[PDB]
Design a protein around this ligand. Structure first.
Ligand SMILES: [Cl-]
Ligand SMILES: [Cl-]
Ligand SMILES: [Cl-]
Ligand SMILES: [Cl-]
Lengths: 441, 192, 50, 50, 49
């Protein structure tokens, strides 16, 4: 159950009650498509059905050629001031998948995988470097072409195939064309992993066969759409009648730990004289999750995805902070943690839509209200930082900007308190601390 | 007519003459596709045209199953120093649409919409919360499957369909597959 | 009359939209400040704050 | 010889690109500054500006 | 004709489904055999004209 508290003293709000799903590691599987090595199409027969097969077989060959050009390259990808995102480190997202992909280029490795998938479509292979991976065969075009399409290709006659075969081949070949299509506009690396790359059935099956915890299996299976978004597909090799690409799946080593979202907004004095005011803003906004005795902090919004009451985050875009970082919500002047803030003289009106309400920073001549769809305006905000819950409120207006509030169910608590900006003498207040803290000020 | 002035004193330039089109609010409509509830495909006939229909009908079922898994989740999305972007507030882009979506989960609301779109493909429905929305039916696979594909599915015979029907069904079903495709890689929320 | 502009190793194509430009001459305001007391560490500031 | 690096709760995989690294030893330059007069609010600065 | 055009659909469990034009063509070629047999069977093996 989601709850929320607004702190009038620091113009901020915390949303509690969430459960964690943090990607901590990676699992790499090798997906294969068995290809038919065919060059020639020996047939002088000008039959329309033969022509259609020839045309489809031509797309097949171009895809293979196109993929071979992609294989020649080494896979790579590249993954505000009121946020602490600049403090983050820089990881290499597909470094694990690429490491596996490089092994696949070694001679014998390809033939090793093909041997394992000879009788079955699912196997575990020991790679020459000494790493085991789940290998899977999702499509056998080699079988279909050699079994259904050989007499119309390998011979001058060329017994004209039925129309249903022409349709069927286009259906089966289509997946190869789409995979090639995605890789070719993404330089061999795609994310999220599409259903062309890995169908819902294949992914669910892969998850079940992943030797992970039953909780992780359940978690990933109920949130496949999120798993896809946190996954990469890496074109590896197309060699000796087999296309292979590495699918890099998220590993959730942290599950069901409490998470909370911190919302922040500018806190300024409200003197009538324009420009005689000083401002203060908490800069530690973002997602927080308890994690191994510390706290994983995610400054950027893109990093975390919320499903009902569970938060999916990526640890690569996080900081590991002392748990005392939470003290900034209760006592920003606490002696255990130096709470991060920024100062300014620019008192501009704005609103932050929270999980269960809205924070309004209203300054100057700005019209700031909250409304119900039926009644209309039910609250007019005064200058300063204020808050309203989503219960009974549908929209909030700050100036010419109308915000819809989240209609998530849950209780809000208004924690009254003197705005801390009132504690500072404007005559000696440093209003040029773009990245600062309580003690630094 | 566009004009422009450069101010040498402050190293800046202003381009005038433009007309506004500002998004100030949101309008939410409910788009519907009538689906045929089919499980079984009773037919032992190994005819190639039957096989193609079966395969296409299998994609249809997987799409439905895939969408049902997506429905289980609550929709959400996340929408330099020389710019003042850091001064901006933080809205919730799909808060209005999601609010409508939640109403649709309430029992009776679904049947209420289906009743309005019974005779027409365009109607306005009063939702139980007290909000009216334009509702639209853009595809009726329920009609097509039950009218063109029932004898080849509901019975052991299974009178083999013409090749043109096999083509036609793939054409109509394709849209459902693509919609499902977009939702599945976008966690149920797409834009544009 | 201009199609491109080059600054260092960077070539910019200009927009070929039709319309009149006006060059408003004026003393660069940076010349009004004494460098000895000029605060050059105001990342987010204003005229009065400087 | 290294495959991963862990900082706090964050596990980074390292690039397995082949190539030689050189560790150039040297006194951390932060040790050269007196903290009593060190400007720690220079968001965009330089050696001489500090 | 049978051994060249119709063997895979007869000699094997698969049975790669033949095109519709072959179905038509075989009926055309086979027809003559059926008619010859037809004439002989109502004429006790001797026909004239
Ligand atoms: Cl045919
Ligand atoms: Cl909105
Ligand atoms: Cl350019
Ligand atoms: Cl990593």
């Amino acid at each position: 159950n989601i709850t929320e508290e607004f702190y009038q003293s620091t113009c901020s709000a915390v949303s509690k009650g969430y459960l964690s799903a943090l990607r901590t590691g990676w699992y790499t599987s090798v997906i294969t498509i068995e290809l038919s090595n065919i060059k020639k199409i020996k047939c002088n027969g000008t039959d329309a059905k033969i022509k259609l097969i020839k045309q489809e077989l031509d797309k097949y060959k171009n895809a293979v050629t196109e993929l071979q050009l992609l294989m020649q390259s080494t896979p790579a990808t590249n993954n505000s001031g009121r946020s602490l995102g600049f403090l983050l480190g820089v990881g290499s997202a597909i470094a694990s998948g690429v490491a596996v992909s490089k092994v696949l280029h070694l001679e014998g490795e390809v033939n090793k995988i093909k041997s394992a998938l000879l009788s079955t479509n699912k196997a575990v292979v020991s790679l020459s470097n000494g790493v085991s991976v789940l290998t899977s065969k999702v499509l056998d075009l080699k079988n279909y072409i050699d079994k259904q399409l050989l007499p119309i290709v390998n011979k001058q006659s060329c017994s004209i195939p039925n129309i249903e075969t022409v349709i069927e081949f286009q259906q089966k070949n289509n997946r190869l064309l789409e995979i090639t299509r995605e890789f070719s506009v993404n330089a061999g690396v795609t994310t999220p992993v599409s259903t062309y790359m890995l169908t819902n059935s294949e992914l669910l099956s892969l998850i079940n066969d992943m030797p992970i915890t039953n909780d992780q299996k359940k978690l990933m299976s109920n949130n496949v759409q999120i798993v896809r978004q946190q996954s990469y597909s890496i074109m590896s090799i197309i060699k000796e009648e087999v296309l292979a690409y590495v699918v890099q799946l998220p590993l959730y080593g942290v599950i069901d730990t409490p998470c909370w979202k911190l919302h922040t907004s500018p806190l300024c004095t409200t003197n009538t004289k324009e420009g005689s005011n000083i401002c203060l803003t908490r800069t530690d906004r973002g997602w927080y999750c308890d994690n191994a005795g510390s706290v994983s902090f995610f400054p950027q919004a893109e990093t975390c995805k919320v499903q009902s009451n569970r938060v999916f985050c990526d640890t690569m875009n996080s900081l590991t902070l002392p748990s005392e970082v939470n003290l900034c919500n209760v006592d920003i002047f606490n002696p255990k943690y130096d709470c991060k803030i920024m100062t300014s003289k620019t008192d501009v009106s704005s609103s932050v839509i929270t999980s269960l309400g809205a924070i309004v920073s209203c300054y100057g001549k700005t019209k700031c209200t909250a409304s119900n769809k039926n009644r209309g305006i039910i609250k007019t905000f005064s200058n300063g930082c204020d808050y309203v819950s989503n219960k009974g409120v549908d929209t909030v207006s700050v100036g010419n900007t109308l915000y819809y509030v989240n209609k998530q169910e849950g209780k809000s608590l208004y924690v009254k308190g003197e705005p801390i900006i009132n504690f500072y003498d404007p005559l000696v207040f440093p209003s040029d601390q773009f990245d600062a803290s309580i003690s630094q000020v």
